[PDB]
Design a protein around this ligand. Structure first.
Ligand code: HEM
Ligand code: HEM
Ligand code: NA
Ligand code: NA
Lengths: 713, 713
């Protein structure tokens, strides 16, 4: 069937904005997963998981009688798709059970692991999500094998369709770099926002870069990809050596024996894949990666034997039975148990990437310290395993259950507790009037609140106006936030705040975070008044102010908006057309196409553009909340053409006279070009739409202001 | 960005079931278009449309000073995509404004027509939809040019994204037949459900079949494609001759001058396309089809000149200025006016397909009768224009406004008005108990009501249980309806009905259409009781019984279900996999993925399969409403394989013993294979889900029983 995507492959795709509809969700509109989870008997689930670990099924027999290592890999892969650039991937939505991830080559045979969990999932039903169950299982695995975890939080609600993620442009699974769709260029520079080295890999190639078994060059790729998943050297070493304390790899025969991945397999496979014609196809004969390595002398028990082997032997390059490069210990005895035959033992083996931890000089220093001090290694691994599995969950307020760690960690972008009465509706009215009497303008008020709130991204639930981090490094200095204007506004609001808080009794006070949002509410209200319309913008207090000491400046850099079409802003020149970047921002903000449309049309006429650019400001009553952007854009009296100086800026001229009326970017004019976006523009630019435009603008403004308010969930 | 569609192009696409969500719609959830339209000042809209006709814009100057022809073509094309096979296409959703239809080659320059209507759309806003406006404009154009229309109904609500329609498999616009994706095979057999001869045409090629200018062979294509749009010979000749009484075609220079269609055009084109480098690119120099034909001596006035020209000259094959085949009158004088230069006249000309109306012997007879009796031609064209523009609107109860014709037309599948008190709740309980005491089984009750209600399709709003047409030809004889079983059920229900009606006072009676539905409801109630659940199934009376004389047997044939996965039925062997057909059926029933899932799993255990097939009947308590279908399907204790005899039938065997437990089709097992459908199955197969399953089944059952109830809204 030929589709629109076939005929017009470069046209913008709005369907990413309309996933997660109430249509595709099997649970009722009123289902609240947190309420369900909070009544789960978590202890009972963990005792069923503990039993499962040593209850082998004959369709996928357990290595060493224990599924622990399989399930640790499962959980690590669930979390391991995470990219800090955009916050997409990670374990937080249980996406490993849908396409494409369920059929990526590096997820081979995790179909079996997830099928092992069905009886448990079935037993507890809606009170435990697949998303949470995958993580919990990896925890129970670690526990069952003698490792003390840092804790666990529930609350990852299940999703019901594949997430729209750009995973790369390659058309071949695992394609080596330098192809027609190479994710690499320059001196091995991996393209943003990707955080893996080949399409269908979690981080790096276990044989070495593009299959070259050089541990020193492989370390480079490990360091770069882990940093793109927000893990530093200590965390990286802890995680790789920690995971590879357990279990084994599977490469018992040639890979050509392995059949279709789950999405490609026959209907009779009933959602499983990688069916193997090599001997029994499973157990002793399993093939997953094609490597055949077992790291430790007790693969089903926590130990410090990974580093004892790493540092106590010298290593020789060898090949698995599938032909993959791997390493064996020179002159070693057979000390490693076999997974099924108790009369057989094997020499220690390592992946190229394991040896990276000894042959890269910075990793070597950490690895030696972990070898000499295995209590340090155990604590680093527990903390890193927690971060790995929780990094995309969002603020601590979303953490459910009896095992949440009490320690507040810097990577959580923590927000202090509120310990005082909040402002009431009369206070909020009084503050709005004080803000408007200060002489701050609509443009200043709307721009500041937009800058504070529009850092949120729903992909990992970071960002938002909670915290008042807009006043702190690095946000206060970002170009899009207009640092000198911003500083002036914040000084005036901090004076308003000091005066209001000094006059109270009873401990009542207002945070700057709340007052920034409220002040933006007053700007929207005043703009509505400027247009002849009395509206109240909703406001919910209870945000708190974080300190600089509670803010990791390097982790916050990924939240900088380098492209924000809501402020007509592009920090530099990109490959990707600015309209595509706008739809990507809308998706991160959780906006639909109609919400994106209303919000951008209003923000243009409110003066929200960076630098006071006139691009898209299609009004003669700036700072009034009207639908002029739509009326003017859709006026066929005006003809548009790209400028000679810059093809991405357009002049709108009177069609009859030639007189210059306006200028606009691609982000402005897409609303008059794309057939679906123009239909939306037509609704708001109709003669009956002023009241609708105002109400829908207020609604979407308030939505953006509240994106991070999981305290009100 | 490589997508799931790229990796697994044969995997099933459920996003067709979740279009048209409240996310994509700019209107609020309780916007009711009918209510808005009923308040529109339709008379005012019409006066503005009359004014527009002759208000020429310089960017697309009006031929002959009057846009009437262009607008008639616009409305004709809006309606002309309609296929009787599935009911998809047509004017009823305004889809000419979205991809792909806004950019189909035969829709060239209709972008201009729609842009000429924007000021009126803007002025009346949500009170008139694009969908209604495109049809009303066509009507006004006719009226302005002297033709009295048969009527007009409003009520076509706008839609907000492209409809999912299979338009063909060709990857080249306009590709002639016999290519790798040919819509033709055998002796020119067009593939169902297509109703046009080339990709991007409305019906046929105006030069003749595959470009060969043979009017007799073109006639064959015209007859076949019009029949596939629900039009017979008389309607066909009236429509082509009526349309071509007006306006002109455009082909003033070579087609290579024409640039990108609207979805391919630059952002500066602001939604328009087909920009032409030939001379002024418009007006006298316009290029649309490449033909240059003006049919009549008065192209802006209703006349009887079409048939006078057709029969009064003999015709010679010639070429337009773009190179296209067309026909010129032998030895004629220059009598046809020029569209822009009063000093120029032209000889009469005709398309190949216009000469079909003279040279095909059966059309010749009609055409001559129209020529000799022009009052007949006028009345047939008025009726056929009404039908063309309203054929996809559904029952008359949906028709809005003050111009709706009072005459009831057979193609509307009319239902008689109800003239008597309806049954109340006490009566319904009395009838359900009578039905259950008669000895009809759960299987029979459920099967019969499903058979009656599941003929509905949302595409053109035909079908459904209202009318009791299940008792009439041809529905009573369809193989999927199990004609001998059906007859026995209807005899028993008609005796119940006669007894109940004979005991009433005050004119109260029940229709058989109501009783069939109510009896289905009693079957579902009984099946819940069989499972230990006390459940009441909602029922709304008020359906009426249509007569055989109100039921066009040939038009009803397109509703026959040749594939109904809900009854595990497939009439023969198809090239499309049966699970794709199930999703296509779900779409026509307006079901989402979770509704399709719950429905099919319940129908399987209630005994709704055709012929009592055991395929998918995964329960040991048939006729009890339980979630057994899901629990058993997802059991990993069972292994599935295709049979040797038939690859589309699967045996499910105990994994440990090899013993046969079940058999299923592709429709059954897809719910265990597709990763999104399996996620839905898991919800209903969980230990906490029996009550959910029952309540969701009742809801979707009710939904299906009321799909055609436009008398209740
Ligand atoms: C540079 C990073 C990493 C690479 C290249 C890598 C590579 C691999 C490969 C190739 C396998 C074998 C798959 C199979 O054939 O069955 C595997 C297994 C495994 N990995 Fe990793 N790994 C990395 C990091 C991690 C991390 C961060 C953890 C968890 C903290 C983890 C835990 C495991 C475990 C537990 C297994 C054993 C599975 C089993 O027993 O079935 N690895 N690793
Ligand atoms: C066999 C079926 C038909 C064929 C092949 C056909 C073909 C076409 C073609 C090629 C053009 C020229 C487009 C352009 O160059 O501007 C056209 C024009 C037009 N057709 Fe048809 N037509 C068919 C049926 C219809 C029907 C059923 C109607 C309406 C009832 C219709 C009404 C018109 C009108 C009014 C024009 C003139 C447009 C203008 O003045 O701009 N035609 N036709
Ligand atoms: Na994420
Ligand atoms: Na339709």
């Amino acid at each position: 069937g030929t589709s629109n995507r076939d005929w017009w492959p470069n046209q913008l795709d709005l369907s990413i904005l309309h996933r997660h509809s109430s249509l595709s969700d099997p649970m009722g509109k009123d289902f609240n997963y947190a309420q369900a989870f909070e009544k789960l008997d978590l202890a009972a689930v963990k005792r069923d998981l503990h039993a499962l670990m040593t209850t082998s099924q004959d369709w996928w027999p357990a290595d060493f009688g224990h599924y622990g290592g399989l399930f640790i890999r499962m959980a690590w892969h669930s979390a391991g798709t995470y990219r800090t650039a955009d916050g997409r991937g990670g374990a937080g939505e249980g996406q490993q059970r849908f396409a494409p991830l369920n059929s990526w080559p590096e997820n081979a045979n995790l179909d079996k692991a997830r099928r092992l969990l069905w009886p448990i999932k079935q037993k507890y039903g809606r009170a435990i999500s697949w998303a949470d169950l995958l993580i919990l299982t990896g925890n129970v695995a670690l526990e069952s094998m003698g490792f003390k975890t840092f804790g666990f939080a529930g609350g990852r609600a299940d999703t019901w369709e594949p997430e729209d993620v750009y995973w790369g442009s390659e058309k071949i699974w695992l394609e080596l770099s330098g192809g027609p769709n190479s994710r690499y260029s320059g001196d091995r520079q991996l393209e943003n926002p990707l955080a893996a080295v080949q399409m269908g890999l979690i981080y790096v190639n276990p044989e070495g870069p593009d299959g070259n078994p050089d541990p020193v060059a492989a370390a480079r790729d490990i360091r770069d990809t882990f940093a793109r998943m927000a893990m530093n050297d200590e965390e990286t070493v802890a995680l790789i050596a920690g995971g590879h304390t357990f279990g084994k790899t599977h490469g018992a025969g040639p890979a050509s024996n392995v059949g279709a991945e789950p999405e490609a397999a026959g209907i009779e496979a009933q959602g499983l894949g990688w069916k193997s014609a090599y001997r029994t196809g499973k157990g002793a004969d399993a093939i997953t990666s094609g490597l055949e390595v077992t790291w430790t002398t007790t693969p089903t028990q926590w130990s410090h034997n990974f580093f004892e082997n790493l540092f106590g032997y010298e290593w020789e390059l060898t090949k698995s039975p599938a032909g993959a490069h791997q390493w064996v210990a020179k002159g070693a005895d057979a000390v490693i148990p076999d997974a099924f035959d108790p009369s057989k033992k094997h020499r220690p083996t390592m992946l190229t990437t394991d040896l990276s931890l000894r042959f890269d000089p910075a990793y070597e220093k950490i690895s030696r310290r972990f070898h000499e001090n295995p209590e340090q290694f155990a604590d680093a691994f527990a903390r890193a395993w927690f971060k790995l599995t929780h990094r995309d969950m969002g603020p601590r307020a979303r953490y459910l259950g009896p095992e949440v760690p009490a320690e507040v960690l810097l990577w959580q972008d923590p927000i202090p507790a509120v310990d005082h009465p909040l402002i009431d509706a009369a206070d909020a009215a009084e503050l709005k009037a004080k803000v408007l009497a200060s002489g701050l303008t609509v443009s200043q008020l709307v721009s500041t609140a937009w800058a504070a709130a529009s850092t949120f991204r729903g992909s990992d639930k970071r960002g938002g106006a909670n915290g008042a981090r807009i006043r702190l490094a690095p946000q206060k200095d970002w170009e899009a936030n207009q640092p000198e204007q911003l500083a002036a506004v914040l000084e005036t609001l901090e004076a308003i705040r000091t005066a209001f808080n000094g006059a109270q009794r009873g401990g009542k006070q207002v945070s700057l975070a709340d007052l920034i949002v409220l002040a933006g509410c007053a700007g929207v209200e005043q703009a509505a008044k400027n247009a002849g319309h009395a509206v109240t913008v909703p406001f919910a207090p209870g945000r708190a102010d974080a300190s600089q000491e509670q803010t990791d400046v390097e982790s916050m850099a990924v939240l900088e908006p380098v492209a924000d079409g809501f402020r007509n802003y592009l920090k530099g020149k990109y490959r990707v057309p600015a309209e595509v970047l706008l739809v990507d921002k809308a998706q991160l903000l959780t906006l639909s196409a109609p919400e994106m449309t209303v919000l951008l049309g209003g923000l243009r006429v409110l003066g929200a553009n960076v630098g006071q650019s006139r691009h898209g400001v299609f009004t003669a009553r700036e700072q009034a909340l009207t639908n002029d952007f739509f009326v003017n854009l859709l006026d066929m009296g005006t003809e548009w053409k790209p400028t000679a100086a810059d093809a991405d800026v357009f002049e709108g001229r009177d069609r009859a006279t030639g007189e210059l009326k306006w200028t606009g970017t691609r982000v402005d004019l897409v609303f008059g070009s794309h057939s679906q976006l123009r239909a939306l523009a037509e609704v708001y630019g109709s003669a009956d739409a002023q009241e609708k435009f105002v109400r829908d603008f207020v609604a979407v403004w308030n939505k953006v202001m509240n994106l991070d308010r999981f305290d009100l969930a």
